[PDB]
Amino acid sequence: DDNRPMDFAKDKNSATLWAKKRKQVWLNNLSKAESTSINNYIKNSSEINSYSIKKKFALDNYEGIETLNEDLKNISTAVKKSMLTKPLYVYYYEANDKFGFNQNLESSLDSNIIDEEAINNFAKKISDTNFIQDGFKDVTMTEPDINSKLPILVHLKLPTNTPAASYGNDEENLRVLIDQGYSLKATGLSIVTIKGKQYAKVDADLIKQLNFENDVISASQWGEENYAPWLKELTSNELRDINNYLGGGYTAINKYLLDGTIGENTSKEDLEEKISNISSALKKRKIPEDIITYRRMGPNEFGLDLNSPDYDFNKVENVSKFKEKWLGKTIPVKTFISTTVLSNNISAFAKRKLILRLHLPNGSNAAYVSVAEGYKNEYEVLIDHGYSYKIDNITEYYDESSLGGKTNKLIIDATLI
Protein backbone atom coordinates (compact mmCIF):
# COMPACT_ATOMS: atom_id res chain seq x y z
CA ASP A 1 0.00 0.00 0.00
CA ASP A 2 1.14 3.56 -0.74
CA ASN A 3 0.23 5.83 2.17
CA ARG A 4 3.59 7.55 2.00
CA PRO A 5 5.27 10.43 0.17
CA MET A 6 6.30 10.28 -3.49
CA ASP A 7 9.85 10.96 -2.25
CA PHE A 8 11.15 9.61 1.06
CA ALA A 9 14.15 11.87 0.48
CA LYS A 10 16.40 11.21 3.48
CA ASP A 11 13.70 9.73 5.71
CA LYS A 12 14.94 6.14 6.02
CA ASN A 13 12.59 5.20 8.87
CA SER A 14 9.43 5.95 6.89
CA ALA A 15 10.82 4.33 3.75
CA THR A 16 11.71 1.23 5.75
CA LEU A 17 8.24 0.95 7.33
CA TRP A 18 6.59 1.25 3.90
CA ALA A 19 9.02 -1.25 2.36
CA LYS A 20 8.73 -3.90 5.11
CA LYS A 21 4.96 -3.74 4.90
CA ARG A 22 4.94 -4.06 1.09
CA LYS A 23 7.62 -6.76 0.86
CA GLN A 24 6.02 -9.15 3.34
CA VAL A 25 2.75 -9.21 1.38
CA TRP A 26 4.54 -9.35 -1.97
CA LEU A 27 6.56 -12.36 -0.80
CA ASN A 28 3.39 -14.11 0.30
CA ASN A 29 2.02 -13.53 -3.21
CA LEU A 30 4.96 -15.22 -4.97
CA SER A 31 5.34 -18.71 -6.40
CA LYS A 32 8.26 -20.82 -5.18
CA ALA A 33 9.80 -20.33 -8.63
CA GLU A 34 9.31 -16.57 -8.31
CA SER A 35 10.74 -16.61 -4.76
CA THR A 36 13.71 -18.64 -5.91
CA SER A 37 14.30 -16.23 -8.81
CA ILE A 38 14.21 -13.09 -6.63
CA ASN A 39 16.74 -14.70 -4.30
CA ASN A 40 18.72 -15.55 -7.42
CA TYR A 41 18.70 -11.86 -8.29
CA ILE A 42 19.91 -10.99 -4.80
CA LYS A 43 22.77 -13.45 -5.31
CA ASN A 44 23.52 -12.96 -8.97
CA SER A 45 22.01 -9.79 -10.43
CA SER A 46 25.06 -8.95 -12.52
CA GLU A 47 25.05 -12.31 -14.32
CA ILE A 48 21.29 -12.23 -14.85
CA ASN A 49 21.36 -8.73 -16.44
CA SER A 50 24.35 -9.54 -18.63
CA TYR A 51 22.48 -12.65 -19.72
CA SER A 52 19.34 -10.68 -20.64
CA ILE A 53 21.50 -8.70 -23.02
CA LYS A 54 23.13 -11.81 -24.58
CA LYS A 55 19.76 -13.38 -25.01
CA LYS A 56 17.88 -10.49 -26.61
CA PHE A 57 20.55 -9.99 -29.27
CA ALA A 58 21.07 -13.67 -30.04
CA LEU A 59 20.11 -15.61 -33.15
CA ASP A 60 16.62 -17.16 -33.31
CA ASN A 61 17.61 -20.66 -32.24
CA TYR A 62 19.80 -19.73 -29.30
CA GLU A 63 19.05 -21.93 -26.28
CA GLY A 64 21.16 -20.23 -23.59
CA ILE A 65 21.10 -21.32 -19.95
CA GLU A 66 17.74 -22.67 -18.71
CA THR A 67 17.81 -21.43 -15.11
CA LEU A 68 18.63 -17.93 -16.30
CA ASN A 69 15.67 -17.97 -18.75
CA GLU A 70 13.54 -18.95 -15.81
CA ASP A 71 15.02 -16.04 -13.82
CA LEU A 72 14.14 -13.49 -16.56
CA LYS A 73 10.57 -14.71 -16.75
CA ASN A 74 10.02 -15.22 -13.01
CA ILE A 75 11.62 -11.99 -11.90
CA SER A 76 9.40 -10.14 -14.35
CA THR A 77 6.14 -11.85 -13.30
CA ALA A 78 7.22 -11.46 -9.65
CA VAL A 79 7.73 -7.72 -9.74
CA LYS A 80 4.56 -7.21 -11.79
CA LYS A 81 2.83 -8.28 -8.56
CA SER A 82 4.20 -5.15 -6.89
CA MET A 83 3.00 -2.23 -9.01
CA LEU A 84 3.08 1.30 -7.55
CA THR A 85 -0.28 3.02 -7.03
CA LYS A 86 1.41 6.42 -7.33
CA PRO A 87 4.82 7.73 -8.42
CA LEU A 88 7.96 6.97 -6.37
CA TYR A 89 11.28 8.78 -6.56
CA VAL A 90 14.31 6.44 -6.19
CA TYR A 91 18.07 6.93 -6.00
CA TYR A 92 21.26 5.45 -7.31
CA TYR A 93 24.82 6.57 -7.88
CA GLU A 94 26.05 6.28 -11.47
CA ALA A 95 29.16 6.51 -13.65
CA ASN A 96 29.87 8.57 -16.77
CA ASP A 97 29.62 5.53 -19.03
CA LYS A 98 25.95 4.94 -18.57
CA PHE A 99 25.25 8.36 -20.09
CA GLY A 100 27.67 7.92 -22.99
CA PHE A 101 29.81 10.71 -21.60
CA ASN A 102 33.59 10.28 -21.50
CA GLN A 103 34.74 13.62 -20.05
CA ASN A 104 35.94 13.62 -16.44
CA LEU A 105 33.37 15.51 -14.34
CA GLU A 106 35.76 15.94 -11.43
CA SER A 107 37.67 19.23 -11.36
CA SER A 108 41.40 18.78 -11.94
CA LEU A 109 42.11 21.16 -9.05
CA ASP A 110 39.77 19.80 -6.36
CA SER A 111 38.38 16.28 -6.06
CA ASN A 112 35.27 17.37 -4.16
CA ILE A 113 34.26 19.74 -6.96
CA ILE A 114 32.54 19.27 -10.32
CA ASP A 115 34.38 20.78 -13.29
CA GLU A 116 32.31 23.58 -14.86
CA GLU A 117 33.16 22.93 -18.51
CA ALA A 118 32.55 19.22 -18.05
CA ILE A 119 29.18 19.64 -16.37
CA ASN A 120 28.07 22.05 -19.11
CA ASN A 121 28.96 19.54 -21.83
CA PHE A 122 27.19 16.91 -19.73
CA ALA A 123 24.10 19.11 -19.73
CA LYS A 124 24.13 19.00 -23.53
CA LYS A 125 24.84 15.28 -23.71
CA ILE A 126 21.96 14.16 -21.50
CA SER A 127 19.35 16.28 -23.35
CA ASP A 128 17.30 15.02 -26.34
CA THR A 129 17.99 11.42 -25.43
CA ASN A 130 16.03 8.47 -24.13
CA PHE A 131 18.62 6.25 -22.42
CA ILE A 132 17.51 2.63 -22.80
CA GLN A 133 17.95 0.66 -19.55
CA ASP A 134 19.00 -2.94 -20.14
CA GLY A 135 18.30 -5.68 -17.61
CA PHE A 136 16.46 -5.22 -14.32
CA LYS A 137 17.44 -2.37 -12.02
CA ASP A 138 17.79 -2.20 -8.26
CA VAL A 139 17.78 1.18 -6.53
CA THR A 140 17.49 2.81 -3.09
CA MET A 141 14.48 4.50 -1.48
CA THR A 142 16.49 7.36 -0.03
CA GLU A 143 19.41 9.61 -0.84
CA PRO A 144 22.21 7.17 -0.02
CA ASP A 145 24.65 8.16 2.70
CA ILE A 146 27.51 6.21 1.26
CA ASN A 147 30.73 7.95 0.38
CA SER A 148 30.32 7.18 -3.32
CA LYS A 149 33.31 7.46 -5.66
CA LEU A 150 30.86 8.01 -8.49
CA PRO A 151 30.32 11.40 -10.17
CA ILE A 152 26.58 11.13 -10.68
CA LEU A 153 23.56 10.77 -8.45
CA VAL A 154 20.42 9.78 -10.33
CA HIS A 155 17.14 10.94 -8.80
CA LEU A 156 14.74 8.81 -10.86
CA LYS A 157 10.95 9.25 -10.92
CA LEU A 158 9.09 5.95 -11.29
CA PRO A 159 5.58 6.50 -12.67
CA THR A 160 2.32 5.03 -11.41
CA ASN A 161 1.95 1.29 -12.32
CA THR A 162 5.71 0.67 -12.47
CA PRO A 163 6.48 -2.86 -11.24
CA ALA A 164 8.84 -2.00 -8.40
CA ALA A 165 9.22 -4.52 -5.61
CA SER A 166 10.64 -4.05 -2.11
CA TYR A 167 13.33 -6.70 -1.56
CA GLY A 168 16.64 -7.62 0.06
CA ASN A 169 18.21 -9.38 3.04
CA ASP A 170 18.52 -6.26 5.20
CA GLU A 171 15.08 -5.22 6.46
CA GLU A 172 16.48 -1.78 7.37
CA ASN A 173 18.01 -1.18 3.94
CA LEU A 174 15.47 -2.73 1.61
CA ARG A 175 16.03 -2.03 -2.06
CA VAL A 176 13.62 -1.54 -4.95
CA LEU A 177 13.64 -3.91 -7.91
CA ILE A 178 12.43 -2.37 -11.20
CA ASP A 179 11.14 -4.50 -14.05
CA GLN A 180 12.97 -4.36 -17.36
CA GLY A 181 11.66 -2.69 -20.50
CA TYR A 182 12.16 0.95 -19.51
CA SER A 183 14.23 3.98 -20.49
CA LEU A 184 15.51 7.06 -18.68
CA LYS A 185 14.64 10.63 -19.71
CA ALA A 186 16.42 13.50 -17.95
CA THR A 187 14.17 16.17 -16.45
CA GLY A 188 16.81 18.24 -14.73
CA LEU A 189 20.41 18.69 -13.68
CA SER A 190 22.07 20.27 -10.67
CA ILE A 191 25.16 20.03 -8.48
CA VAL A 192 24.55 18.82 -4.93
CA THR A 193 26.96 18.50 -2.01
CA ILE A 194 26.83 15.30 0.04
CA LYS A 195 29.21 14.86 2.99
CA GLY A 196 31.42 17.63 1.62
CA LYS A 197 31.61 16.22 -1.91
CA GLN A 198 29.85 17.38 -5.12
CA TYR A 199 27.76 15.19 -7.39
CA ALA A 200 25.94 15.87 -10.61
CA LYS A 201 22.31 15.17 -9.72
CA VAL A 202 20.41 13.95 -12.76
CA ASP A 203 16.72 14.24 -12.25
CA ALA A 204 15.03 11.90 -14.71
CA ASP A 205 11.75 10.17 -15.52
CA LEU A 206 11.43 6.45 -16.10
CA ILE A 207 9.52 6.08 -19.37
CA LYS A 208 8.63 3.19 -21.70
CA GLN A 209 9.43 3.37 -25.44
CA LEU A 210 7.98 1.08 -28.09
CA ASN A 211 10.61 -1.61 -28.45
CA PHE A 212 9.59 -5.10 -29.45
CA GLU A 213 13.02 -6.68 -28.91
CA ASN A 214 12.13 -10.38 -29.47
CA ASP A 215 8.34 -10.07 -29.58
CA VAL A 216 7.74 -11.11 -33.18
CA ILE A 217 3.95 -11.36 -32.78
CA SER A 218 3.55 -7.84 -31.39
CA ALA A 219 6.00 -6.43 -33.93
CA SER A 220 4.12 -7.96 -36.83
CA GLN A 221 0.74 -6.83 -35.57
CA TRP A 222 2.10 -3.28 -35.15
CA GLY A 223 3.67 -3.22 -38.60
CA GLU A 224 0.52 -4.54 -40.28
CA GLU A 225 -1.77 -2.23 -38.35
CA ASN A 226 0.23 0.87 -39.09
CA TYR A 227 1.42 0.22 -42.64
CA ALA A 228 -0.97 -2.13 -44.46
CA PRO A 229 -2.96 0.90 -45.74
CA TRP A 230 0.36 2.49 -46.74
CA LEU A 231 1.10 -0.58 -48.87
CA LYS A 232 -2.30 -0.74 -50.56
CA GLU A 233 -2.18 3.00 -51.37
CA LEU A 234 1.25 3.07 -53.06
CA THR A 235 1.40 4.17 -56.69
CA SER A 236 2.34 1.37 -59.08
CA ASN A 237 5.85 2.74 -59.55
CA GLU A 238 6.36 3.21 -55.77
CA LEU A 239 5.23 -0.36 -55.16
CA ARG A 240 7.46 -1.55 -57.97
CA ASP A 241 10.59 0.22 -56.75
CA ILE A 242 10.02 -0.65 -53.09
CA ASN A 243 9.61 -4.28 -54.30
CA ASN A 244 12.86 -3.88 -56.27
CA TYR A 245 14.75 -2.42 -53.31
CA LEU A 246 13.53 -5.25 -51.07
CA GLY A 247 14.31 -7.93 -53.64
CA GLY A 248 18.00 -7.07 -53.65
CA GLY A 249 17.89 -3.76 -55.46
CA TYR A 250 19.00 -2.14 -52.21
CA THR A 251 22.70 -2.83 -52.83
CA ALA A 252 23.03 -0.85 -56.06
CA ILE A 253 20.60 1.86 -54.92
CA ASN A 254 22.26 2.52 -51.58
CA LYS A 255 25.71 2.29 -53.15
CA TYR A 256 24.71 4.94 -55.70
CA LEU A 257 23.48 7.15 -52.87
CA LEU A 258 26.72 6.54 -50.99
CA ASP A 259 29.24 7.45 -53.68
CA GLY A 260 27.45 7.92 -57.02
CA THR A 261 28.83 4.70 -58.48
CA ILE A 262 26.90 3.34 -61.46
CA GLY A 263 27.55 -0.17 -62.73
CA GLU A 264 26.31 0.45 -66.24
CA ASN A 265 23.92 -2.30 -66.88
CA THR A 266 21.86 0.54 -65.41
CA SER A 267 21.75 4.33 -65.81
CA LYS A 268 21.97 7.41 -63.63
CA GLU A 269 18.39 8.05 -64.74
CA ASP A 270 17.11 4.62 -63.62
CA LEU A 271 18.90 4.82 -60.29
CA GLU A 272 17.55 8.34 -59.72
CA GLU A 273 14.03 7.20 -60.65
CA LYS A 274 14.05 4.27 -58.24
CA ILE A 275 15.47 6.46 -55.45
CA SER A 276 12.85 9.16 -56.04
CA ASN A 277 10.02 6.57 -56.00
CA ILE A 278 11.22 4.81 -52.84
CA SER A 279 11.74 8.20 -51.13
CA SER A 280 8.31 9.49 -52.07
CA ALA A 281 6.89 6.20 -50.75
CA LEU A 282 8.70 6.68 -47.44
CA LYS A 283 7.24 10.16 -46.96
CA LYS A 284 3.65 8.89 -47.17
CA ARG A 285 3.01 7.72 -43.62
CA LYS A 286 5.30 9.17 -40.94
CA ILE A 287 6.32 6.91 -38.03
CA PRO A 288 3.30 7.27 -35.73
CA GLU A 289 5.12 7.00 -32.40
CA ASP A 290 8.76 6.78 -31.23
CA ILE A 291 10.09 3.29 -31.86
CA ILE A 292 13.38 1.49 -31.34
CA THR A 293 14.81 -0.12 -34.45
CA TYR A 294 17.92 -2.17 -35.08
CA ARG A 295 20.62 -2.65 -37.66
CA ARG A 296 23.50 -5.11 -37.88
CA MET A 297 26.06 -2.80 -39.48
CA GLY A 298 29.07 -3.98 -41.49
CA PRO A 299 32.49 -2.52 -40.56
CA ASN A 300 32.58 -0.23 -43.62
CA GLU A 301 29.77 1.88 -42.15
CA PHE A 302 32.39 3.12 -39.67
CA GLY A 303 35.43 3.35 -41.95
CA LEU A 304 36.69 -0.14 -41.10
CA ASP A 305 37.62 -3.27 -43.04
CA LEU A 306 36.73 -6.80 -41.93
CA ASN A 307 40.45 -7.30 -41.43
CA SER A 308 41.17 -3.90 -39.87
CA PRO A 309 43.10 -4.32 -36.60
CA ASP A 310 40.80 -1.71 -35.03
CA TYR A 311 37.83 -3.97 -35.84
CA ASP A 312 39.16 -6.49 -33.32
CA PHE A 313 36.88 -5.73 -30.36
CA ASN A 314 38.20 -8.71 -28.38
CA LYS A 315 41.03 -6.40 -27.40
CA VAL A 316 39.93 -3.80 -24.86
CA GLU A 317 42.16 -1.16 -26.49
CA ASN A 318 40.12 -1.22 -29.71
CA VAL A 319 36.80 -0.92 -27.92
CA SER A 320 38.27 2.09 -26.09
CA LYS A 321 39.50 3.53 -29.40
CA PHE A 322 36.10 3.11 -30.96
CA LYS A 323 34.29 4.66 -27.99
CA GLU A 324 36.61 7.67 -27.92
CA LYS A 325 36.25 8.12 -31.67
CA TRP A 326 32.49 7.86 -32.07
CA LEU A 327 30.82 8.59 -28.73
CA GLY A 328 28.56 11.64 -29.03
CA LYS A 329 29.19 12.10 -32.75
CA THR A 330 26.66 12.94 -35.43
CA ILE A 331 26.65 10.54 -38.38
CA PRO A 332 25.23 11.79 -41.67
CA VAL A 333 23.49 9.08 -43.73
CA LYS A 334 23.25 9.58 -47.51
CA THR A 335 21.65 6.17 -48.02
CA PHE A 336 18.29 4.66 -47.18
CA ILE A 337 18.44 2.95 -43.80
CA SER A 338 17.23 -0.65 -43.61
CA THR A 339 16.42 -1.54 -40.01
CA THR A 340 14.42 -4.17 -38.21
CA VAL A 341 12.08 -3.73 -35.23
CA LEU A 342 13.58 -6.86 -33.67
CA SER A 343 16.71 -7.12 -31.53
CA ASN A 344 17.20 -10.69 -32.87
CA ASN A 345 20.48 -11.40 -34.69
CA ILE A 346 20.15 -12.27 -38.41
CA SER A 347 21.73 -15.29 -40.13
CA ALA A 348 23.04 -13.48 -43.21
CA PHE A 349 24.75 -10.93 -40.96
CA ALA A 350 25.30 -13.12 -37.90
CA LYS A 351 28.93 -12.12 -37.29
CA ARG A 352 28.61 -8.37 -37.78
CA LYS A 353 30.03 -6.71 -34.64
CA LEU A 354 28.19 -3.38 -34.65
CA ILE A 355 24.60 -3.28 -33.53
CA LEU A 356 22.69 -0.04 -34.08
CA ARG A 357 19.90 0.45 -31.57
CA LEU A 358 18.27 3.52 -33.10
CA HIS A 359 15.65 5.74 -31.52
CA LEU A 360 13.35 6.40 -34.49
CA PRO A 361 11.21 9.36 -33.51
CA ASN A 362 7.54 10.00 -34.17
CA GLY A 363 7.19 11.89 -37.45
CA SER A 364 10.18 10.25 -39.18
CA ASN A 365 9.86 9.44 -42.88
CA ALA A 366 10.12 5.67 -42.68
CA ALA A 367 7.79 2.73 -43.26
CA TYR A 368 7.31 -0.83 -42.09
CA VAL A 369 8.07 -2.29 -45.54
CA SER A 370 7.61 -5.84 -44.28
CA VAL A 371 3.87 -5.52 -44.77
CA ALA A 372 4.71 -6.26 -48.41
CA GLU A 373 3.94 -9.84 -49.45
CA GLY A 374 6.80 -12.33 -49.12
CA TYR A 375 8.61 -10.06 -46.63
CA LYS A 376 6.53 -10.57 -43.47
CA ASN A 377 9.45 -12.38 -41.83
CA GLU A 378 11.95 -9.52 -42.27
CA TYR A 379 10.29 -7.20 -39.72
CA GLU A 380 11.91 -4.38 -41.64
CA VAL A 381 11.48 -0.61 -41.28
CA LEU A 382 13.01 1.38 -44.12
CA ILE A 383 14.11 4.94 -43.37
CA ASP A 384 14.31 7.71 -46.00
CA HIS A 385 17.72 8.84 -47.28
CA GLY A 386 19.38 12.01 -45.99
CA TYR A 387 18.92 11.71 -42.25
CA SER A 388 21.59 11.81 -39.56
CA TYR A 389 21.90 10.19 -36.15
CA LYS A 390 23.78 11.09 -33.04
CA ILE A 391 25.51 8.41 -31.03
CA ASP A 392 24.17 8.38 -27.47
CA ASN A 393 26.10 5.40 -26.16
CA ILE A 394 28.37 2.49 -27.11
CA THR A 395 28.09 -0.61 -24.92
CA GLU A 396 30.02 -3.84 -25.42
CA TYR A 397 28.81 -7.38 -24.74
CA TYR A 398 30.35 -10.78 -25.53
CA ASP A 399 28.57 -12.89 -28.14
CA GLU A 400 30.01 -16.32 -27.30
CA SER A 401 28.09 -18.27 -29.96
CA SER A 402 30.04 -19.67 -32.90
CA LEU A 403 27.54 -18.49 -35.50
CA GLY A 404 27.72 -15.04 -33.89
CA GLY A 405 31.48 -15.05 -34.30
CA LYS A 406 32.78 -15.59 -30.74
CA THR A 407 33.36 -11.88 -30.28
CA ASN A 408 32.65 -8.73 -28.34
CA LYS A 409 30.02 -6.69 -30.12
CA LEU A 410 29.01 -3.05 -29.67
CA ILE A 411 25.47 -1.92 -29.00
CA ILE A 412 25.40 1.54 -30.47
CA ASP A 413 22.53 3.54 -29.02
CA ALA A 414 21.64 6.38 -31.34
CA THR A 415 18.90 8.92 -31.99
CA LEU A 416 17.75 9.88 -35.49
CA ILE A 417 17.91 13.68 -35.95
Author numbering: 3 to 419
Sentences from the paper on this structure:
The structure of CPILE-a can be divided into two domains, N-terminal (amino acids 3–211) and C-terminal (amino acids 212–419). We conducted detailed analysis of actin ADP-ribosylation by each CPILE-a and Ia against both α- and β/γ-actin.
Using mercury-soaked crystal data, the structure of CPILE-a was solved using SHELX against the single anomalous dispersion data set at 2.28 Å resolution. Using the triple Cys mutant structure as a template, the final structure of wild type CPILE-a was refined at 2.01 Å resolution. The CPILE-a crystal belongs to space group I222 and consists of one molecule in an asymmetric unit. The overall structure of CPILE-a was similar to that of other type IV ARTs. Comparison to Ia, CPILE-a contained a flexible loop (A60-I67). Thus, these two loops were named PT-I (G262-S269) and PT-II (E402-K408).
